């Protein structure tokens, strides 16, 4: 009867840490998808900013020549 | 200069093969070694051009002839870009544990051709 | 190692103790120059506390420690505690005996005369050093970056120094010293933090202020235009989960404190900004020697790592400076270790022999040997 309590109590500990872990893991998994999307989005913008400032580099150069 | 009248090119190759085979370097092994040498040739043929990254007169290094630097990473089969992030740019951290590579320094031309 | 014999490189400041083995390009074991005791009386029995808690062991556990810093920019509050800082350097991390390999330390420009003789007493008489020199902070970095003709402004947490070294050191003054860096920014935060229900009270957690600072805090390009932007809660506040557990939405807090750098009027000092003092040093030199100084400006130190540090200089300088030639500032993307890279240089030079102090040289010219040969 006592041994039953020991194992039954472990079941409560196991069930508790299981639902808690899965609950946060699911929340984390969903969050990663949002962060990953933000990464892809920001990376895309950075690419547009990089190619733009580079276009100004060749633009400011040719203008400097015409000015000279 | 490449073609020379004195020395015969096609005639020597077959003699080199004999020398390798006579010692202990079969064609199977030869090919396995040529890949290593051919890899270096790809990482060799890359004298990067002027990189208009700076503002005034100085400059850094950047690839214009990509297919050449791509060949260097081709045999390596790695992200062509990431490769140049750690080489042309010098990364250093260290302290406590031991180093963490990512943040780096676009070095000048002299140190650029130096590492090259 | 069947190469040479007796060689090493070192460098200390108000942040990290940069040091390594013989003939190295980069440091090997950097650690915070801290040291404290126990405000908690360390389980007195779970060891006779002692060892103030210096080194990684100290930085690991801050709570028990009452981090009382010894060398605040120039002044050494106490030398007795310095004894067991170098006892941790050469013996624990470096794993080499100081009674063999030379040592290359750094010199805080214009350091009290009485200090030099005191230091030498700790090395020669106690740690027995038959060869060592204490080079002057800035000049070292000059030869590393590959510059012979530029103006250096090397400073991190210690003291600000405007060293116009492009063709000669030790000559007219044209140099300045300002106790406004690092720890000044580390202590000022807790003050203004009070208005946001935050207060890093004691010194132990004060050290963390610096940790978070160097990962987000940036400098405002123009405070006026960014004042109205405050309404737009997007570029300001950013969720920073404190390791323990207490979010801090730093936003306007990021570009408010750094403003003190260019405006020392926020802490009761008439000291002019780092771009005014620059003029003060340039106006002393000849008239036909400025056009080349503006061409290249050596901005080094960990203080020159924050966002918006170089671009701001090119805005304020051009105003009260000649406007004809081109002006470019050389700020090595990693300009903190500029001193160490330069340290590696002088560490491998043989001409350096006509600089350091030999064991016998000290006894032949008394304690004044330092200021009798060096300068
Ligand atoms: N990338 C960085 N960004 C911001 N701060 C940095 C960076 N790298 C180093 N630091 C800081 O710079 C300081 C060390 O700079 P340093 O010039 O060596 O100082 P000192 O010479 O006064 O000892 C430390 O506070 C460190 O945290
Ligand atoms: Ca210093």
> Furthest-apart CA pair in chain C: how many Å?
72
CATH 3.30.420.40 at C4-34+71-134+337-371, yes or no:
yes
Cβ-based interface (< 8 Å): residues of C facing B = 16, 26-31, 56, 146, 295, 326, 328, 332-334, 337
Q: Cα–Cα–Cα angle for C47, C53, C55, nearest 5°?
A: 135
Distance CA C156, CA C17 (A): 13
* Contact yes or no, C with B (3+ CB pairs under 8 Å): yes
Fold of the C35-68 domain: Actin; Chain A, domain 2 (2.30.36)
Report the side by side order of strands in the sheet with C297-300: C151-154, C297-300, C329-330
Distance CA C355, CA C347 (A): 12
Kindly report, as residue ranges, where domains of CATH 3.90.640.10 are found in chain C: 182-267
The closest of C346, C318, C362, C293 to C136, measured between CA atoms, is C346
- Establish whether residue C258 lines the binding site of ligand 1, counting it when its CB lies within 6 angstroms of any ligand atom: no
The closest of C92, C96, C91, C87 to C1, measured between CA atoms, is C96
Fold of the C136-181+271-332 domain: Nucleotidyltransferase; domain 5 (3.30.420)
| Under 8 Å between Cβ of C172 and C374 | no
By DSSP bridging, strand C103-107 and strand C17-20 are unpaired
The Å distance, Cα C211 to ligand 1 centre, comes to 10
Q: What is the DSSP secondary structure assignment for residue C238, as one 8-state letter? A: B
> Furthest-apart CA pair in chain A: how many Å?
98
| Under 8 Å between Cβ of C96 and C8 | yes
Query: Which ligand has its closest atom nearest to the C-alpha of B103?
Result: 1
Kindly report, as residue ranges, where domains of CATH 2.30.36.70 are found in chain C: 35-68
Among chain B residues, the shortest Cα distance to A53 is held by B53
Check CB contact under 8 Å for C29 and B95.
yes
Structure tokens at C281: 């040093």
| Under 8 Å between Cβ of C28 and B92 | no
Tell me phi and psi for residue B60, to 5 degrees. Answer: -110, -145
**Best of C111, C152, C157 to mutate for ligand 1, by most ligand atoms within 8 A of CB?**
C157
- Establish whether residue C336 lines the binding site of ligand 1, counting it when its CB lies within 6 angstroms of any ligand atom: yes
For this entry, resolution in Å reads 7.7
The Å distance, Cα C161 to ligand 2 centre, comes to 10
Residues of B in contact with C295 (CB under 8 A): 56
| CATH fourth-level superfamily of C182-267 | ATPase, substrate binding domain, subdomain 4 (3.90.640.10)
Tell me phi and psi for residue C19, to 5 degrees. Answer: -160, 165
The Å distance, Cα C46 to ligand 1 centre, comes to 35
By DSSP bridging, strand C297-300 and strand C329-330 are parallel
- Helices B80-87 and B66-74 sit at what angle, rounded to 10 degrees? 90
| Under 8 Å between Cβ of C10 and C105 | yes
To which residue do tokens 């969720």 refer?
Answer: C239
| Under 8 Å between Cβ of C250 and C239 | no
Whole-Å CA distances, B91 to A46, C142, C146: 22, 20, 18
Kindly report, as residue ranges, where domains of CATH 3.30.420.40 are found in chain C: 4-34+71-134+337-371, 136-181+271-332
């Amino acid at each position: 009867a006592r041994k039953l309590v020991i194992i039954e109590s472990d079941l409560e500990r196991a069930e508790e840490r299981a639902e808690l872990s899965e609950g946060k893991c699911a929340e984390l998994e969903e969050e990663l998808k949002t962060v990953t999307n933000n990464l892809k989005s920001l990376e895309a913008q950075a690419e547009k900013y990089s190619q733009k400032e580079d276009k100004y580099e060749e633009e400011i150069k040719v203008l400097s020549d015409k000015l000279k | 200069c490449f073609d020379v009248s004195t020395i015969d090119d096609s005639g020597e190759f077959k003699i080199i093969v004999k020398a390798m085979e006579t010692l202990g370097l079969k064609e199977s092994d030869q090919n396995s070694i040529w890949r290593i040498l051919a890899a270096i040739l790809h990482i060799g043929n890359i004298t990067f051009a002027e990189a208009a990254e700076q503002r005034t007169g100085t400059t850094t290094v950047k690839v214009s002839d990509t297919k050449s630097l791509a060949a260097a990473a081709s045999c390596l089969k790695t992200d062509q870009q990431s490769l140049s992030i750690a080489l042309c740019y010098r990364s250093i951290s260290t302290g406590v544990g031991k180093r963490c590579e990512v943040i780096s320094v676009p070095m000048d031309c002299n140190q650029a051709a130096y590492s090259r | 190692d069947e190469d040479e014999t007796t060689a090493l490189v070192c460098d200390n400041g108000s942040g990290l103790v940069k040091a390594g083995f013989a003939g190295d390009d980069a440091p090997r074991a950097v650690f915070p120059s801290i040291v404290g005791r126990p405000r908690h009386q360390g389980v007195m029995v779970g060891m006779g506390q002692k060892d103030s808690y210096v080194g990684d062991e100290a930085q690991s556990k801050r709570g028990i420690l009452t981090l009382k810093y010894p060398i605040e920019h120039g002044i050494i509050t106490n030398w007795d505690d310095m004894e067991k800082i170098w006892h941790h350097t050469f013996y624990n991390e470096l794993r080499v005996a100081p009674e063999e390999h030379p040592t290359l330390l750094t010199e805080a420009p214009l350091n009290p005369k009485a200090n030099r003789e005191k230091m030498t007493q700790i090395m020669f008489e106690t740690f027995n050093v038959p060869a060592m020199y204490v080079a002057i902070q800035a000049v070292l970095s000059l030869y590393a970056s590959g510059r012979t003709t530029g103006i250096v402004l090397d400073s991190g947490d210690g003291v600000t120094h405007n060293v116009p070294i492009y063709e000669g050191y030790a000559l007219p003054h044209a140099i300045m010293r300002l106790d406004l860096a690092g720890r000044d920014l580390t202590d000022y935060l807790m003050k203004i933090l009070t208005e946001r229900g935050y207060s890093f009270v004691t010194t132990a957690e004060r050290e963390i202020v610096r940790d978070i600072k160097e990962k987000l805090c940036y400098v405002a390009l123009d405070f006026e235009n960014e004042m109205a932007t405050a309404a737009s809660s997007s570029s300001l506040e950013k969720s920073y989960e404190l390791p323990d557990g207490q979010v801090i939405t730093i936003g306007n807090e990021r570009f408010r404190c750094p403003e003190t750098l260019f405006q020392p009027s926020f802490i009761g000092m008439e000291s002019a900004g780092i771009h005014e003092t620059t003029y003060n040093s340039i106006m002393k030199c000849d008239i036909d020697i400025r056009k080349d100084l503006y061409a290249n400006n050596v901005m080094s130190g960990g203080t020159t790592m924050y966002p918006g540090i170089a671009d701001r200089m090119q805005k304020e300088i051009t105003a009260l400076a000649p406007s004809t030639m081109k002006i470019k500032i050389i700020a090595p993307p990693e300009r903190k270790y500029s001193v160490w890279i330069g340290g590696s240089i002088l560490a491998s030079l043989s001409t350096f022999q006509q600089m350091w102090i030999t064991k016998q040289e000290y006894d032949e010219a008394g304690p004044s040997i330092v200021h009798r040969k060096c300068f």
